[PDB]
Design a protein around this ligand. Sequence first.
Ligand SMILES: Nc1ncnc2c1ncn2[C@@H]1O[C@H](C[C@@H](N)CC[C@H](N)C(=O)O)[C@@H](O)[C@H]1O
Lengths: 156, 157
Amino acid sequence: ALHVVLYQPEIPANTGNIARTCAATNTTLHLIRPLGFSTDDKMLKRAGLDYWEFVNVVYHDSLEELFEAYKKGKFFFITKFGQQPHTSFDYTDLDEDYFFVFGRETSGLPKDLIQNNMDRCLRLPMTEHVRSLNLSNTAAILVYEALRQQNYRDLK
Amino acid sequence: VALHVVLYQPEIPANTGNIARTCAATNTTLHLIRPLGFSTDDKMLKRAGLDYWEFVNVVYHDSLEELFEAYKKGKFFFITKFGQQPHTSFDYTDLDEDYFFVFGRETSGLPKDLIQNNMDRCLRLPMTEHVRSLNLSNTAAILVYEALRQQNYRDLK
RNA sequence: GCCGGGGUGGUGGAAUUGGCAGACACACAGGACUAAAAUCCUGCGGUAGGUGACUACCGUGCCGGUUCAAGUCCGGCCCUCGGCACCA
Ligand SMILES: Nc1ncnc2c1ncn2[C@@H]1O[C@H](C[C@@H](N)CC[C@H](N)C(=O)O)[C@@H](O)[C@H]1O
């Protein structure tokens, strides 16, 4: 019911951790195929430990292919640019598929896409001591915020 | 009046580095219960590229009891998979109290007897069933931002 | 000065009465593992033929000798440590 999209990830271990977090929440992981690693990177495998068999991982050769395939979806885009924190939105409809899309670790999301949908742009309130926050951590804050709103349904 | 993340004998280096990242992005004081499984020497801190350590405000403690007796009136929430309550069932809004979030060991976990005595404040992030545990990094960050959700991201841009 | 130890890979270092030199540990390297500076598995003296299987070759401070065979025994020398002597 929940989805995590990774636009061309770079760090294998970051993605592997997110896969484990997905298996702990029964979340679908989406990957935009211009990846910075291979499918056989051993750091990818390690970060996912043994939980890989419980992750439904979907590959998409482009951001477009994903959007069209999941035409009925609440696509939430997570960048520094959004003027609204992630907790100011609503994820409480359980009859829906919620999509959280994460940019490249050293780039962002496509600047065209951010322009068109700034109402769905979630910025995690930080300080100035760091420029960003680890993707695998940032992915988890949103899954367990949305899971709070859905009252961790079926999850004990 | 801020949040406090204390890590009981952390071992895997990368987890603690990512926790310090979140701690610097939230101005959350990081308490470190020794023995640690790594080295926080400035040489090794810079070998891992941890340039935010200066802003993390790390308070090394040598025992869990030392930490309890230095911050006696801290609200100590112990975070383990053996809790029965979520992390969102408690109130971290009081800006007059010091809230402390205790995390465990990546290969072992929090002291079992400490969990038994204080099951009232034992928080379990709801997982599936086939997943034994979450990442220490992820578990810490989730808790920091849930308290900041309740604290409306005080002085956070 | 005498006597007695030590010298051996990248490192500390092992090798019994002469009979496969480098055990073992650290380093390193490749992996595995219930995000490793944890742990576990594997490789590791050199050379060249080598895809490799591996092979032969060389290698214990220098130079000798005894041996079928010398890290090992013998003689000279270099370096080093210790006891003893040596000190107007
Ligand atoms: N589901 C979870 N709920 C709460 N804390 C967790 C969870 N998974 C991991 N943690 C944190 O990470 C620590 C270590 C675990 N990752 C490892 C398994 C260990 N047996 C345990 O006590 O959970 C825990 O002691 C917590 O600090």
